[PDB]
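In practice, a research group might receive sequence data for several interacting partners and want a quick structural hypothesis before committing to experiments. The following worked case mirrors that situation: the sequences arrive first, and a predicted assembly follows.
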Amino acid sequence: STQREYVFIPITNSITIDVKITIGGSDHITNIDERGIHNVLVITGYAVDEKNGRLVPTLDPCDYVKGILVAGTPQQAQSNDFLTLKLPANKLYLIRKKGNISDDLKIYIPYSSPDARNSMKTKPVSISDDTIVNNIIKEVFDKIYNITQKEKVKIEKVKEDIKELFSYYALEQ
Amino acid sequence: STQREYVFIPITNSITIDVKITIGGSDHITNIDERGIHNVLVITGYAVDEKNGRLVPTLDPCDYVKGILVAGTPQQAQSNDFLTLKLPANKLYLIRKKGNISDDLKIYIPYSSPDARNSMKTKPVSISDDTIVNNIIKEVFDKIYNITQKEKVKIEKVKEDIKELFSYYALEQ
Amino acid sequence: VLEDSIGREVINRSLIRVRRIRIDRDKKVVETGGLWSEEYVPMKTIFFSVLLGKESKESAIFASCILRNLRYVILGGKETIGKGIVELRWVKDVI
Amino acid sequence: RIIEIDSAKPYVWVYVTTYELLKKVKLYLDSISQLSNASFSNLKNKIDTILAKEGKNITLDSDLKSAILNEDFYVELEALNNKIPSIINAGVPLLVLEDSIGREVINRSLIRVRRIRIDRDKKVVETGGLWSEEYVPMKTIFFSVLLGKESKESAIFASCILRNLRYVILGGKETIGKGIVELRWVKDVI
Amino acid sequence: LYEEDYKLALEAFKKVFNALTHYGAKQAFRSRARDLVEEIYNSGFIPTFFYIISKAELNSDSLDSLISLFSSDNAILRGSDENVSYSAYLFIILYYLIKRGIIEQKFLIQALRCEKTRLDLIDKLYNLAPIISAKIRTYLLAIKRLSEALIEAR
Amino acid sequence: YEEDYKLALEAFKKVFNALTHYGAKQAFRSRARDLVEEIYNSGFIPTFFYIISKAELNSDSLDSLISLFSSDNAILRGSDENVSYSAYLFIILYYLIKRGIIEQKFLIQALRCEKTRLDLIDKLYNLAPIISAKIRTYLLAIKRLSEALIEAR
Amino acid sequence: AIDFLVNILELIKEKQCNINLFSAISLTSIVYNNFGEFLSNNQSYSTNNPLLKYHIIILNDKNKTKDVEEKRNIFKREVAELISRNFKLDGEKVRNYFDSLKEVLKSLKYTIVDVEITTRTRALIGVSTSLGKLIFGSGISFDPYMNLPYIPASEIKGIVRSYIEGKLGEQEAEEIFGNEEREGNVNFTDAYPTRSKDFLFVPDVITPHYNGKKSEADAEPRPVIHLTIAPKVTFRFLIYYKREDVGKPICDSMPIILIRGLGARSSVGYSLFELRKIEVIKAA
RNA sequence: GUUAAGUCUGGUUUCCCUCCAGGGUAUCUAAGUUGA
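A structural hypothesis for the assembly, expressed as tokens:
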């Protein structure tokens, strides 16, 4: 089956190299098709773990995180602390939809540990300050979507739509 | 006061013999304001026997003589062969009434008494031939229009509608 | 996209005014006073509105589960003569 | 709403005010001018030059010379001192009517709406669930003043809070999406 | 001074009512007023207007009768019960166009009696279409109410 | 003064008695609930045209009204709606007579001619902004009386 | 612009079935009602507008007026024939419309009954509706945005209900089609033509001689050219409902009520139809 | 047996809204005599 990984998009710089497979065959859930990003995943009840870049399970339905969904695997040296699960694609809260998704996904979410010493308290965040955006674009998208900077002038479009698309909640630490 | 003058649109040439005064003042009411010719009165009830043209009256209301309204007394060697009349200008039949009126409009119209020998015959006419248009456009209007030659740049807006907006019912006998 | 002083008349004349009747079940003719008109708005007409929500945990689940799976509804009257079916396209989802 | 005869400048709607409403605004400004250090000489003189034209309907940001307001009321306007710059800025003319006419025009400008209530399991109206209801149109302009008495907190209020107040929710029916409103301070808009 | 839609309807209907001598003419005019408004909405003012002009069966004395009605108030609409009903509804529409100052009376008459001016009348109406379609249907609705109030069924 | 509620009681008495069929009574109740709100929103003259359109003042219902002025036993004949609208028109004309807005002498030689009826409508047009402000509470009372007395159909 | 007018018949015959027939006929009516004026040297001097053919032919010389009148009668017949031959049916858009609508209804958990019926005799639906009314006097129930003639869902529901209350009483009807105190349990879509044989419209005439006449001394034929819906035209509509009950009365009602009229002038055998196909998609 | 020529008519009339729902519920005021 088409193994998937949820490379989430916080601002901090631990995001470039976390997925093994770049393309696999020629498929990826998330599309970038001249209108901006498409078929973006959104998870609720989870906060960004910018410190020790991850995402930890919270219980609040207002805490969401975003990030594209692509084809990959934990490099055979990870996923000791990952959530992986098999969904029928009817359970995916997919924002910015383009088409339909076949069936029987297998997602890998960058998980965390409970760590019940310190209390969690999350804040709404933004991805602005394109000084932040550009390194992610040159680190997250290209290594996955090589057609980026191959037939596209609509890249600044991706910049303002990361301005307008990706937000999240992080533990304010 | 002011006493204007009305002349037809023929296919023949007898126009200089009588019209004298270009403007006699500051500004006309008939205009080429880059919107088309405006306030061109329409006579209804006359017939045009225009070899050395002067108007003859008919009985039909579908016989219409159409021209422009020149301000000026023609030749001051007349007023015994012209149909002189001063309508209060709200009993005048115009085209594209834009502005107001002098509240009284004395009109000197070249007139040919009927002298019934034959039986009248009236034929409508639509004109053409851009040359046969210009050779009226800017010799007799020019005699009466002088604020042109510096702002009436595209003469086409008059040379194109003189061949569609004007007509009459010709006699030819 | 017309200027308003003409687009107003255009859009107003752009609506369908259908005349219905009621029939005398015995004469099989039209009842007196049984004739009236109705205005419909054509198929594929587009209306734009916004759905707003205050901060809450219910607002979260509403916007994130309910408003996803809500695409077709029935609006207005005349639902039995087939009128009133509507698709809701969220700008957020697909501009 | 307007159907403007004698104008190739097509306005679909227009702003309408009367001399009585202007007199009331002038009273507000006169009173709070004394009771404070502030002055509104620009606004006050605009209002005063309009009020000087009492007796005749006038228009401010155009030269209409006649109109048909709210489908029923003919007016014959005049031009104010060759384009006196008007208070609001919306590229739409403001008309100042005689209050007799303005009363009916303003009544015809309100929005009356029948609403109903439907039983939750049989898609038929409930008994008594039918009523009318009145709104003031969108794009309506009200004039108010916010006055404060000397204090420390009054300065923080006037300098920190009132500079981040633009959009507030007045009135009721806030689920029919009524009552969103924009506060525009006279000091930084006039 | 300016007369609004209902007052103009009153004046027009009053000038028509006295001219329709036979009562069948009046009842056919009632039937006209009661549906020509929905026609004008569905087909447009200019199509329906020229349909009315045709169904008035002018090209007779009916034309000078219809123009005399504008001023004499001693004039009578002559023709069959269908012809005069359409002729009177045509007078209704012409009276509106003239009083609202949309088209002058002389041009309307000359376009109504001349093969030539009719086509440029079509052109002019396509020019002036918004100014008319904006509010003619309220005045015509008032005409409809006056007709179904002052006249009865067959 | 509040004698407009009294005037409403008198008019509603005359109407409630001149509508012999209970269907006509219920139809008048409907007219009462609707037409006052329509005069509020759309103005008097529009609603008056609407009402005289649906009352069908031929020549016979007209005389029933002129008699209903005087004879407390006159009845209204016709369709339920056709008589409810005529009853409401009588309500209006009654108020106009009693408050002396127009002389009953005039209003009588108007309901008999079709040649001064248009002059009646013209006169009522010269007075619409007066009537519109006067009749408000009177018609509100008529509506309240109709909802109170007549059975909801 | 007048040039849109004097070139509208050319448009009907060249843009066939891809022109807005409602506006087309509406504009054609202006020419038809000013015929005498559009012929007085205003044919636009083209060669494929039917309007100068009425300058070649001579029908009368002792009367220009009669000339125009007979030419205009011919022109009315020719407009009917133009619309009938040129405006054909392409029912691909309707097939797509109904498939998508049926998918929508399957999502909303309705139980759809998709019914296909075929015209057997020249039908007349919407004879008082405006389409060709300003030329012919009659009309057809025409949807100007599907650019088709259609059968209103209200008409079909009224006929089905008239029959059901005929053979099941005035109470089971209100049990199915509701009353002033309950909503109906059965929904109807309009019916649109999905496939014809050759034509969609067809000219026809009706010529009353004696209707409304006293004797033979005032009898006169007055012939009324008009348009009807050709035979063999297949309409389809949907019927959807949520309760399973109402499936029974509608099923058996469908074949029966169609063989008798579905439009106007059924009494003289005009709007006679034929149940072509019925199909029931149950949801849950 | 032969000649010529078609001519007349060219959609009318009804119905234009009917009935029901015309406000219901909750809040109905809270909180606060001193000196010559």
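Before designing any experiment, note the following. Residues 27-28, 31, 34-35, 37-38, 82, 144, 148, 153-154 of chain E lie near RNA strand H (CB under 10 Å from a C1'). The interface with chain G takes residues 39, 42-44, 46-48, 50-51, 53-54, 59, 115-116, 118-119, 122-123, 126 of chain E (CB under 8 Å).
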